[PDB]
Amino acid sequence: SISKDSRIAIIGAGPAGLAAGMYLEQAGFHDYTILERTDHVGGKCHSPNYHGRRYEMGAIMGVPSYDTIQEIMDRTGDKVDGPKLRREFLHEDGEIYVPEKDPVRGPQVMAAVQKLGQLLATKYQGYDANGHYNKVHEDLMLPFDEFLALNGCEAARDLWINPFTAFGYGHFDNVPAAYVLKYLDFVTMMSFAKGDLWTWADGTQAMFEHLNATLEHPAERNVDITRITREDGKVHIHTTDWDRESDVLVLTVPLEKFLDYSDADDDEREYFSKIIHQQYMVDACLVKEYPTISGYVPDNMRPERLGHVMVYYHRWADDPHQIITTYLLRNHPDYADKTQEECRQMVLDDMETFGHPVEKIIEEQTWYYFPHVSSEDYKAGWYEKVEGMQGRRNTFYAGEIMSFGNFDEVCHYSKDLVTRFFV
Ligand SMILES: Cc1cc2nc3c(=O)[nH]c(=O)nc-3n(C[C@H](O)[C@H](O)[C@H](O)COP(=O)(O)OP(=O)(O)OC[C@H]3O[C@@H](n4cnc5c(N)ncnc54)[C@H](O)[C@@H]3O)c2cc1C
Ligand code: NA
Numbered sequence: 001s002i003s004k005d006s007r008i009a010i011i012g013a014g015p016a017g018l019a020a021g022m023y024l025e026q027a028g029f030h031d032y033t034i035l036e037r038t039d040h041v042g043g044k045c046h047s048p049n050y051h052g053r054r055y056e057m058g059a060i061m062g063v064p065s066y067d068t069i070q071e072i073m074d075r076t077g078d079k080v081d082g083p084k085l086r087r088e089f090l091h092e093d094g095e096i097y098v099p100e101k102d103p104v105r106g107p108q109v110m111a112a113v114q115k116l117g118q119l120l121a122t123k124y125q126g127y128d129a130n131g132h133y134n135k136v137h138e139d140l141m142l143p144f145d146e147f148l149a150l151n152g153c154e155a156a157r158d159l160w161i162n163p164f165t166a167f168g169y170g171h172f173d174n175v176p177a178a179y180v181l182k183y184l185d186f187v188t189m190m191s192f193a194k195g196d197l198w199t200w201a202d203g204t205q206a207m208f209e210h211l212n213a214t215l216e217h218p219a220e221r222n223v224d225i226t227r228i229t230r231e232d233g234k235v236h237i238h239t240t241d242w243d244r245e246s247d248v249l250v251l252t253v254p255l256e257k258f259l260d261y262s263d264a265d266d267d268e269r270e271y272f273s274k275i276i277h278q279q280y281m282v283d284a285c286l287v288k289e290y291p292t293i294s295g296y297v298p299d300n301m302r303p304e305r306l307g308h309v310m311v312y313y314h315r316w317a318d319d320p321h322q323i324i325t326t327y328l329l330r331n332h333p334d335y336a337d338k339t340q341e342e343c344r345q346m347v348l349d350d351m352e353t354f355g356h357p358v359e360k361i362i363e364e365q366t367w368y369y370f371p372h373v374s375s376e377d378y379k380a381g382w383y384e385k386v387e388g389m390q391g392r393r394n395t396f397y398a399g400e401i402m403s404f405g406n407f408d409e410v411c412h413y414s415k416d417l418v419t420r421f422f423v
């Protein structure tokens with residue numbers, strides 16, 4: 001349905017663009033170019049060095065059902081070889097609790113998980129399809145808490161929240177269920193609860209660096225795109241060092257930001273302007289009284305505690321002078337954004353409360369994170385519209401907004417974009 005000779009420009013060398021290149025290439029499309037703005041590849045899979053080891057500034061983990069990432073590893077020769085994840089739960093005062101052994105709440109949560117599992121198996125069949133082009137059940141378009149409440153499954157949120165809100169994906173009072181359950185589908189949720197999780201000694205970034213290297217055309221880096229225009233059935237890309245024509249455009253970069261350097265048509269401007277995102281802040285810390293295990297703080301995942309540390313990552317157990325990363329959110333639709341400065345102070349105060357006082361913050365990053373749309377915009381058919389635009393003036397839309405903000409979902413989506421439109 002697209003000719004193998006086509007000149008394909010892929011924008012972004014994160015997992016989504018690297019995966020697009022991989023699957024295009026494996027389908028016989030040999031004339032692609034990946035254009036990356038930064039010096040590096042892997043995007044939010046970002047694994048810097050410190051004292052001879054890599055720590056994670058972005059993505060850390062996967063699950064055994066990450067079949068597309070397995071396919072990437074098969075190609076690169078990478079293996080799941082990182083340290084085992086373990087965790088404890090803390091209250092906002094730093095006291096350790098065991099929600100699994102709460103004899104009142106515990107059964108109520110697991111009862112609701114049971115009930116939800118059966119709904120997902122029957123009534124909501126299809127919910128877990130990659131992407132949103134297969135229109136989900138209307139109930140899944142509601143905020144996750146409303147969806148649960150409609151089904152009498154509210155207590156399930158106690159399980160689902162920990163790998164969601166603390167992972168920067170926002171809050172169940174407003175995030176549509178369709179996103180929550182495509183990421184944490186039942187089998188995935190069960191893997192998280194069991195601790196059956198993948199990590200990489202050399203960082204999530206490594207396998208993407210290795211993927212890039214296996215490509216017939218590794219990414220061009222430090223490419224500053226000033227304008228894209230799409231006349232006469234072609235794509236013209238202007239950069240600070242060259243300007244070139246392509247036949248096809250694949251976008252794995254933020255679509256609202258794309259409006260600012262493109263000849264965005266009426267629909268693009270209208271719809272991509274509706275995209276909202278998360279401000280997810282990570283601090284790479286050196287600490288005293290080194291933790292012995294990672295910690296989750298459900299109390300700090302409430303919208304009323306916005307900006308507090310929700311989780312910290314104990315990566316290298318053997319070395320107390322290694323990096324502990326902390327995670328917090330700076331935005332919520334119903335509260336004013338928290339400033340970088342007040343959040344940083346909460347890093348210091350919370351880690352102190354938890355008994356792991358910060359000696360040094362060596363790196364901090366607020367990521368552009370989990371692009372999505374509101375329940376109202378989802379219900380109003382945002383994905384029917386945008387997916388209906390696929391191919392218009394030879395432009396295809398992919399990346400996080402089109403699926404979910406995790407590395408397996410975006411790579412899966414890229415794989416399928418090829419099947420759907422190209423082959
Ligand atoms: C702190 C943190 C924790 C996370 N935890 C996990 C996890 O445990 N499991 C999981 O599966 N995922 C996790 N993620 C999410 C995961 O990293 C992302 O979903 C994944 O990297 C998305 O890939 P992508 O290619 O769509 O986007 P990105 O990774 O954001 O990559 C986009 C690329 O496009 C480039 N780009 C942007 N604009 C332009 C432009 N103007 N021109 C050219 N290039 C451009 C960027 O530089 C980047 O290389 C985590 C992320 C973070 C930050
Ligand atoms: Na860099």
Ligand code: NA
Binds near residue numbers: 099100159193
């Ligand atoms: Na549990």
